[PDB]
Amino acid sequence: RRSRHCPYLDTINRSVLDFDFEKLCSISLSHINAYACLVCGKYFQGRGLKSHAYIHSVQFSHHVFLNLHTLKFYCLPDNYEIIDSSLEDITYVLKPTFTKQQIANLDKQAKLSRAYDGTTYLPGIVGLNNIKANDYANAVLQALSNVPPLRNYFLEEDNYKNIKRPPGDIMFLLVQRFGELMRKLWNPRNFKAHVSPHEMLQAVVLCSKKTFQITKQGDGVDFLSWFLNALHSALGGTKKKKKTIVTDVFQGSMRIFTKKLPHPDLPAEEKEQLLHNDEYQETMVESTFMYLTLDLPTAPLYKDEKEQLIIPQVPLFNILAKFNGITEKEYKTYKENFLKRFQLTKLPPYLIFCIKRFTKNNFFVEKNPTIVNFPITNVDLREYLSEEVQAVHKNTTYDLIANIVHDGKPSEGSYRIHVLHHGTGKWYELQDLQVTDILPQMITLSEAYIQIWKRR
């Protein structure tokens, strides 16, 4: 058996293999026995005489191919299995085998990884390819990354297969493709220092239908609101899993006291009787949040008298002062206003802060470009919880992990991401493939849009 040795081992080109495309046959549009040539990097239908792979092998004289399901290499022109010590490296690219020790020894990792093309990088800090208006998708995927509670559930393929999938389950592909993409980007050894979400946006547009179409730039907040919900709903078939891997990470309990009919059309005596009626008062409205919303002061709309066109800088604690009994916001809707006061009763391990920049006016949608001064490694949130709950939590301090910054008008945007490499303190800026170790001040200077924390 000449299977083990091959006189065509050197013809393989490792920098041409781009395994981020759809694993379907190019010639005849099939996923069965997807075989990839290594000389040039094309997909085929499988082995066998007069097969598309065989025809290509006997036409281009490309001998050694690769199986994308059994992960076992073959020489099609004579069609025998190929086993080599070096060739194993290629198998680590498409299907990275992250054993539990590598997950356990990755937050303590401070060595820059090696790429075959020579483009140095750090795992996790990887540029997601912007094929078509994927700036928001890349931003949310990177922000969802670097979350150790979520980081330690997808680097192993044996974590999400065991879940029950109903016959009508049409969203498990989202979970499995998220896991595979995360393994591709967290790969210590890959040919390209970047990775294309081409296999991921397809699952996104299949699960979310035409919504979040990659033609037009999507909304980050509207995206992750559906994304975390879809991750929660996929995990668990015909079984109410109120707490799943993503629920016990970002979800937190929240209290709301809501009063209604404060409308000015009511006279003083009628409103006094209304509040006397005991029908319209603060109510028990405790629920769950996947992410805390932040409402900003409106743009100054006027030049400052001394320094014209002053940049509006507001401390973060002013925004977070909404979540306490002291302040109450009037979420007026339709005919009667609704005065709601917010409160925190269960801090999630990681706190998400979405920021309401983009808002529609009476006529046209604008953005609120109000800069916020926010720390990154020391914040206290103990004032926002009732003492009958404050005793439970001995950790109310959060450290920033990921930050989302948007550019320009809503119809013309380009997301940028500030990621913190845990273990070290290097804050890296990624837009499409950008890599730059910024200082902890450029994070404050820019206008944030979505922030990720960690209670430690």
Add this chain to the structure above:
Amino acid sequence: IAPNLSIIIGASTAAKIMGVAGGLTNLSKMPACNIMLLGAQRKTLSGFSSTSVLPHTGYIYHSDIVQSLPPD
């Protein structure tokens, strides 16, 4: 040493204008027009209007009291 001058402009700019003037006695013999130009750098205009790079501007023009006012 100069309680009256140190409160109108503040002690910092007061020191900057008394040290460069050669002492309180020296600047007491100095007209206010010249006291304006105390420490007035002849900044090289970088292909701009001379109005853009403050011309004939001294430490008193950079004091906290005046900067509180609109540029005009």
